[PDB]
Amino acid sequence: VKKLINSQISLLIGKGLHEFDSLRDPEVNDFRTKMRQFCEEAAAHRQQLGWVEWLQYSFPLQLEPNRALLVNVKFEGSEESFTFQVSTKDMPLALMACALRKKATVFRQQPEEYALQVNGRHEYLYGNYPLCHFQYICSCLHSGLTPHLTMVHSSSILAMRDEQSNLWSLEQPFSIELIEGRKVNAMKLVVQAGLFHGNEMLCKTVSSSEVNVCSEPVWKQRLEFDISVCDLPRMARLCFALYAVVDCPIAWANLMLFDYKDQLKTGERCLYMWPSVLLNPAGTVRGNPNTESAAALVIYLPEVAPVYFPALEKILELLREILERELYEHEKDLVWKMRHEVQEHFPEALARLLLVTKWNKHEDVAQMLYLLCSWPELPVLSALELLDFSFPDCYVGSFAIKSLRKLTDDELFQYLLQLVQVLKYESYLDCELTKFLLGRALANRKIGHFLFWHLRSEMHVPSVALRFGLIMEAYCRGSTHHMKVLMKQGEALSKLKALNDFVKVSSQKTTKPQTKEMMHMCMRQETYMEALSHLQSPLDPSTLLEEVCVEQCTFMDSKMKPLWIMYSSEEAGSAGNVGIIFKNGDDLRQDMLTLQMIQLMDVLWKQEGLDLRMTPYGCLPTGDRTGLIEVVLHSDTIANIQLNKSNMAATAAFNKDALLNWLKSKNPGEALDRAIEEFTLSCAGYCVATYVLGIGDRHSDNIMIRESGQLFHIDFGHFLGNFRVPFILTYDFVHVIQQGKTNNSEKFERFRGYCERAYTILRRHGLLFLHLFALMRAAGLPELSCSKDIQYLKDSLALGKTEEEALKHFRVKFNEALRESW
């Protein structure tokens, strides 16, 4: 029971709980206890919520960002069903009323006491929303399906809730002693060091002497820095970089001069260093957990008495506009001088002010903190900038979190990826971000679900394993029922990896149709049939992966042999037919980030009243170079369509005609003008999106098109011009945009109009894209590793330029892409 839950949580996080105890770090012991209570309390509150409020936790409504329609409905106990005529603008209650009246006429004798469960899905229909706003109904429109719903009474819903229950006086120049080592290299060895607050240095870099290349060296040098003990900030960081010289980095190590309880770090410290794959302030402040092979640096932090960092109470007592839109020294002085009026008249310039203050001056810092305490709540966009590595202070961070509490579950969900990456900056295990995320995660099952997998995937990384395992453990104490749902997924993912290795070996000896049959034999085995069937999709907790259709399952013949897994459900009909791509051996983190952005562009466009028919399909990294991808049904690649396949409905003489012929065959009659509008809008957005993000290697094999006419791109392994990518236009698309005519300038200017509208809309939001890409420098993706990668986004959107200049410059780029297009 208790051991079962503990051994289940270890099974789930992929790390033994005992490994946390064996450290004997009281910070860790303190984190597990504080959080467990926090998380446990959230579950207690959650058990007293009303059935409709419970549905908002467990079944978050999936909405869309005069005409009637057919709809099927039924009840829980009985299996008989009925159909109705209802408006797109009608409410769930209106639908539930006719459903109640039809049962009241068949049964022969209160809509507010029912909820419409989508059959064979983890979705419900309720609230003050017109039937059109629901994704499941909006889906039934384009597919022409019959919505099948179950009338679940308030009593039955509460039965599910029940069954799912669980100081300044020290004015000496700061110094430390450098004792001995235990490393390998061959020359002479040196040890640089330095103090930091964020990216900036608190003083100068003090190197040691050139001891010869050969040992477990001994220096025993008192390294005295160019800064006083009184001038050290609460979040002072001390780096170390060991290297050889006659140029060669060997290892790096960082640590906080203060502890988590605010006390200055005393005496003797052994630092287990990480390799290099010169000085790295961004890197984690905890030591390498591979104690055996990891080299080290033993040092002494001199004592000075039990000294603690001053409490708040103590600190509390201690041509202007022209430049406020980096800066000079005479300007830095002006900004700092005027600091009072920046609070009063320019509160949203806080981030700019914090950068001009001297963090190596406890007076400037006390006066800065003093102002910051009485600063007003900034916007969510401004708060995201305050979570940058440049703002390490806790008071700043705690205030940034204060301003992100207003995020909706959907706005939180949009930024969640970046919020998990900021935890990699965090100096102390317990923090407000962790407190926030975890609290929000326990308030919404979809946020908890998605946060979980964001943590769970990076467990194989040593720098975060401890941090993330602890947060996940906490979540499982708070979400005991969801933990089981998540295990079923883990077991499925566990099998998928085993099955995929088989398929990878098999393909090297045998052939594809044999491997395919061999693979299906493995799937039919007892453990695989139970493990891969019946589970909520990791890509979408509302989709249910029920019966795995083994005959339809396969893999693509491409290096990593990605598995193609297909599902079906009797209870859902066609809505229960869903496919997933399991990938292993490649990192999908970049693909998820490229997709997150495309989806954000669709939101910012949709918010300005512009729907460019984008297809931001699910992609979820779940483990070590492991993840799932969502199969977008009723779609095929341009290469598979351009084949110009023999005796198909799209037989064409030339390549240009292949595309449009495919659309005529999938959208006959009046349906084709809708499909070309769909194609034009989606193409505009994907032309703009791939241009802004710089997505190269765009061949017909990785560009797709839906049977509805919507264009979409796949395989986002290379972004930000890291194969300077130009704007791209293919003649085969221009031809379709032009309704299959060599000259339809009428349509072409509408198209060019969408590319111009879209492009400018994103420039107005250029800072959001920059603010979110700035927090991803924590993640460590090969192509999001420096300011030069952020410079691509600044340049592509042209933020330094005005609207007039950027649009004029973009029209030339658009024309240039049109000239190169044959």
Ligand X SMILES: CCn1ncc(-c2nc3c(N4CCC(n5c(=O)[nH]c6ncccc65)CC4)ncnc3n2C)c1C
Using the structure block, give the residue that is written with the tokens 């959080």: 35
Choices 369-377, 565-573, 625-633, 660-668; region in contact with ligand X by CB under 6 A? 625-633
Amino acid at 227: I
Q: Which of residues 81 and 637 has its CB atom nearest to ligand X in the complex? A: 637
CB of 599 to ligand X, least distance (A): 14
Among 637, 644, 739, 760, binds ligand X (CB under 6 A): 637
Choices 118-126, 137-145, 429-437, 627-635; region in contact with ligand X by CB under 6 A? 627-635
Reading the block at residue 740, the tokens are 């299959």
Rounded distance between C-alpha atoms, residue 197 and residue 466, angstroms:
24
Among 584, 635, 682, 738, binds ligand X (CB under 6 A): 635
CB of 558 to ligand X, least distance (A): 8
Which stretches does DSSP call E strand in 563-652? 563-569, 573-584, 619-623, 626-631, 635-637
The 3-state DSSP class for residue 71 equals: strand
Among 491, 715, 756, 795, binds ligand X (CB under 6 A): 715
Rounded distance between C-alpha atoms, residue 588 and residue 539, angstroms:
13
- Contact map string, positions 566 to 585, toward ligand X, x by CB under 6 A: ---------------x----
Taking CB under 6 A as the rule, does residue 560 contact ligand X?
no
- Contact map string, positions 70 to 89, toward ligand X, x by CB under 6 A: --------------------
Q: Which of residues 482 and 583 has its CB atom nearest to ligand X in the complex? A: 583
Contact 526, 576 (CB under 8 A): no
Enumerate the β-bridge partners of residue 563.
Answer: 555, 582
CB of 701 to ligand X, least distance (A): 7
Question: How, if at all, do strands 81-87 and 68-75 pair?
Answer: antiparallel
Q: How many CA atoms lie within 13 A of 623 on its CB side?
A: 18
* Residue-level length of the chain: 822
Taking CB under 6 A as the rule, does residue 655 contact ligand X?
no
Nearest Cα neighbor of 592 from 559, 614, 617, 557 is: 617
Q: Which of residues 557 and 570 has its CB atom nearest to ligand X in the complex? A: 557
Nearest Cα neighbor of 535 from 559, 499, 569 is: 569
Taking CB under 6 A as the rule, does residue 632 contact ligand X?
yes
CB of 586 to ligand X, least distance (A): 8
Choices 162-170, 423-431, 537-545, 636-644; region in contact with ligand X by CB under 6 A? 636-644
Which stretches does DSSP call E strand in 11-111? 68-75, 81-87
CB of 591 to ligand X, least distance (A): 6
Measured from each CB, the residue nearest to ligand X is 714
Q: Which of residues 547 and 587 has its CB atom nearest to ligand X in the complex? A: 587
Taking CB under 6 A as the rule, does residue 640 contact ligand X?
yes
Distance in Å from the first CA to the final CA of the chain: 70
CB of 684 to ligand X, least distance (A): 21
CB of 717 to ligand X, least distance (A): 7
Taking CB under 6 A as the rule, does residue 556 contact ligand X?
yes
- Contact map string, positions 584 to 623, toward ligand X, x by CB under 6 A: -------x-------------------------x------
Handedness of CA 364, 367, 373, 379 (dihedral sign): negative
Among 82, 129, 564, 748, binds ligand X (CB under 6 A): 564
Rounded distance between C-alpha atoms, residue 626 and residue 586, angstroms:
7
Q: Which of residues 362 and 561 has its CB atom nearest to ligand X in the complex? A: 561
Nearest Cα neighbor of 566 from 543, 585, 541 is: 543
Other CB atoms within 10 Å distance of the CB of residue 435? 15
Other CB atoms within 10 Å distance of the CB of residue 345? 12
Choices 283-291, 411-419, 626-634, 650-658; region in contact with ligand X by CB under 6 A? 626-634
Helices 26-46 and 462-478 cross at an angle (nearest 10°) of 30
Q: Which of residues 432 and 624 has its CB atom nearest to ligand X in the complex? A: 624
CB of 776 to ligand X, least distance (A): 19
Q: Which of residues 117 and 554 has its CB atom nearest to ligand X in the complex? A: 554
Question: DSSP letters along 525-584, please?
Answer: SHHHHHHHSSEEETTEEEEEE-EE-TTT-EE-SSSS--EEEEEEETTTEEEEEEEEEEEE
| Element at 189 (helix H, strand E) | strand 188-197
Among 119, 164, 542, 554, binds ligand X (CB under 6 A): 554
| Element at 105 (helix H, strand E) | helix 92-106
CB of 716 to ligand X, least distance (A): 7
CB of 519 to ligand X, least distance (A): 12
Q: State the number of binding residues for ligand X (CB under 6 A).
A: 16
CB of 629 to ligand X, least distance (A): 5
For the chain, what is the radius of gyration of the CA atoms? 30
Residue 770, C-beta contacts closer than 8 angstroms, at least 6 positions apart: 790, 793, 794, 799
Q: Which residues bind ligand X (CB under 6 A)?
A: 554, 556, 564, 581, 591, 617, 629-632, 635-637, 640, 714-715
